[PDB]
Amino acid sequence: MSYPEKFEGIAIQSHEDWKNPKKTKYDPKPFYDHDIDIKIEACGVCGSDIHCAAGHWGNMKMPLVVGHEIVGKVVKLGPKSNSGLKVGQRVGVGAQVFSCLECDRCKNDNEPYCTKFVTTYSQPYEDGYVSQGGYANYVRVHEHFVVPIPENIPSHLAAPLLCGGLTVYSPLVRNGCGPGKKVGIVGLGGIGSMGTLISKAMGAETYVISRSSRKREDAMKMGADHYIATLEEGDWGEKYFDTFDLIVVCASSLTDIDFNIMPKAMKVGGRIVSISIPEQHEMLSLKPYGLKAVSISYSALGSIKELNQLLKLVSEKDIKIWVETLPVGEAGVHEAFERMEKGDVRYRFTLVGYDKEFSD
Amino acid sequence: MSYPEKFEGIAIQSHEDWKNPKKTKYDPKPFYDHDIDIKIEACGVCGSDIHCAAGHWGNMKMPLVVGHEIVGKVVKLGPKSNSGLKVGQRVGVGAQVFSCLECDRCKNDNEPYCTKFVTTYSQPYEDGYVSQGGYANYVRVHEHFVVPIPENIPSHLAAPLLCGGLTVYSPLVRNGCGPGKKVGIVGLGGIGSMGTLISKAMGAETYVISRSSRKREDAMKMGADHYIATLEEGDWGEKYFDTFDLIVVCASSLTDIDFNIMPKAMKVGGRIVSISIPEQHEMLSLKPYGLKAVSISYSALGSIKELNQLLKLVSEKDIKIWVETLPVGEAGVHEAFERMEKGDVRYRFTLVGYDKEFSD
Ligand SMILES: NC(=O)c1ccc[n+]([C@@H]2O[C@H](COP(=O)([O-])OP(=O)(O)OC[C@H]3O[C@@H](n4cnc5c(N)ncnc54)[C@H](OP(=O)(O)O)[C@@H]3O)[C@@H](O)[C@H]2O)c1
Ligand SMILES: NC(=O)c1ccc[n+]([C@@H]2O[C@H](COP(=O)([O-])OP(=O)(O)OC[C@H]3O[C@@H](n4cnc5c(N)ncnc54)[C@H](OP(=O)(O)O)[C@@H]3O)[C@@H](O)[C@H]2O)c1
Ligand SMILES: [Zn+2]
Ligand SMILES: [Zn+2]
Ligand SMILES: [Zn+2]
Ligand SMILES: [Zn+2]
């Protein structure tokens, strides 16, 4: 029906026909004291959107609305709301959508690591409702996880930051990325590029680390201080020995990644932080003998604090990421999904034209 | 013959008979401009002394004088010596004995991680001579790697800190071991014991992590603010979820770290540092999302700068490690290698009584 009782969206109907989501109406989650309703206007197509829909993460209950780099207008506020969020405001919602908000980790700005963590879609809340929203007309989210979008960031350029961006930003900040450091980006995909830009915006000397040579010209155009092509090096660890302070791995998979070499290019005390979550059938493998004075670790999304910090940065040092736009709808999400599989993205897809697709 | 012509120690003869080191004389390494000669007066038994003799590091060119926790007085100073070391001065030498002292890692106090790194024993120098010293009347080391043992530290207690000690000290100071911070030591062995102490010494709430409760009492005696039993407490990472900032492991190895549990006990940002040395080819496989907000790596000895700090620390806060001495001689050694390869050590042996064993 309409916005209050039913939500509509382009939802995955089966993990086999994942490339052909169908428009669907579905019950919103129950509305809670702090939840907020957002009418979407733009959403970013994230690699996770794919892994999930393709069933790479396990059998997900269907139907399923994906997409978690949401930008839209506040349309209704929860009873016990409190955060200046005002109906009509252009806000954003990323990958996380809930946290206990009371444990130390939460109060210490580490809600991505909260015990009661809940992702935007494909997860059941305590009430049992499995998070939806994203490629839809409305999303229902607890206010703590809704951020304001700096007035000067085009929606189609703000959206991706909400997850792909925040995902590189959190590890970068936390691990010293900034003036005078030598940062490295593995995998120039959707996150990688944002991670390259954001890298520079923070002040470091960034190295893009890809396997083929295709993305070279593009990397420099983003401000890369240098480019490396694994397949063309034979042992870049050996060659770039003792150069990197921090390296963030943003690959969609870890199969074409040598964690037995990477350490060499790491300065004493350097740190390797992987950001990826590959198919359920993959491990992070390496001969430990190399983690000599080098630390390897995995990182989740970022804190909402960091998320606002990023939004501030992109807004201030005026960051313009690489996005292509497609209209929400079965045909658009199809092309989006299709191309993401083909890796045929000039980095980021942002579904738009939400109002001329969902009507009432 | 004697000191100038050639030394003599309790050398090993074969990786097989490694438990029966026969006394042997050998030509000292060349005496370069900046080297120094030390008539050892005390030495500590390091686990690695065993590991090397047993051949866990591969087949070594025989014979071989192990031991690299050397304590002794200065005999001669190379023609260009400029450390400020006086002859007869009480100094010490540990696991490292050389570094290019010209590379960045060096001018930045990271000698252990230097390219031209050379260990105290069983390794050829730039010139080919295989490093000796240790369980002998003397040892010829580059002055740079000679530290002035503090006047108030009984030489049978100073020695262990040269290696063992320093090995845990570094990981601790480099990872912020101190007031507030909650340190966790895994493996109440030799290195593990000096760790618990130094940890408390440095002002950090310390937990000792062993599987059994055997050493449970000793731990509390050394200052441990708490004790944990691996096998005994089942899922300790759960019980102690989100507590440790740092954990320096000293057990069997890094690939024995049940990451399906240990990480759990690490607070977001936590560091698991192994101090054991992995096989150049051991390969580790943890979930891509296993080290969630937890890093993992290993450390090697420490810089002399740190080595001195440790000494200064031990001197001032006056710490006494749990040492048991033995006669520096074929007989003694056997008792040591024999009780080391068993754990029948009250943490650290110190082969003393040099003067009354080598004569001339
Ligand atoms: N922890 C978190 O909070 C979080 C949040 C969001 C996403 N993620 C993870 O981030 C990934 C999403 O990727 P994305 O959306 O940023 O980018 P994407 O547009 O999917 O591109 C991924 C890029 O990584 C590289 N890649 C793909 N397959 C690879 C393989 N087999 N071996 C080595 N490199 C490969 C490619 O770059 P090159 O060809 O240039 O090497 C590719 O362009 C997923 O794995 C997801 O689980 C984690
Ligand atoms: N990187 C460096 O600079 C450096 C310098 C010196 C030494 N090291 C390394 O440090 C180790 C030397 O040990 P150490 O001399 O300090 O002590 P040690 O007296 O040899 O005792 C080692 C202790 O670790 C634990 N352990 C032994 N086998 C184990 C196993 N299979 N699984 C789990 N835990 C086990 C035991 O403690 P619990 O029974 O209480 O658990 C044992 O008492 C070697 O592995 C060496 O390579 C590295
Ligand atoms: Zn929480
Ligand atoms: Zn994402
Ligand atoms: Zn040692
Ligand atoms: Zn050097």
Curated annotation (Swiss-Prot), chains A, B:
It catalyses: a primary alcohol + NADP(+) = an aldehyde + NADPH + H(+); (E)-cinnamyl alcohol + NADP(+) = (E)-cinnamaldehyde + NADPH + H(+); hexan-1-ol + NADP(+) = hexanal + NADPH + H(+); 3-methylbutanol + NADP(+) = 3-methylbutanal + NADPH + H(+). It is an enzyme of class 1 (oxidoreductase). Its main location: cytoplasm. Its cofactor is Zn(2+). InterPro entries: ADH-like_C, ADH-like_N, ADH_Zn_CS, CAD-like, GroES-like_sf, NAD(P)-bd_dom_sf. NADP(+) binds at residues 47, 51, 188, 190-191, 210-211, 215, 250, 252, 255-256, 275, 277, 298-299, 301, 348. It comes from the Eukaryota. Keywords: Cytoplasm, Metal-binding, NADP, Nucleus, Oxidoreductase, Phosphoprotein, Zinc. Coiled coil: none annotated. The keyword Transferase does not apply. The modification Phosphoserine is found at S131, S359. Optimum pH is 7 for the reduction reaction and 10 for the oxidation reaction. GO terms for biological process: alcohol metabolic process; aldehyde metabolic process; furaldehyde metabolic process. Its EC number is 1.1.1.2, 1.6.-.-. One of its GO terms (molecular function) is alcohol dehydrogenase (NADP+) activity. PANTHER family: ALDEHYDE REDUCTASE. Belongs to the zinc-containing alcohol dehydrogenase family. Present with 21700 molecules/cell in log phase SD medium. Homodimer. This is NADP-dependent alcohol dehydrogenase 6. It comes from Saccharomyces cerevisiae (strain ATCC 204508 / S288c) (Baker's yeast). The gene is ADH6.
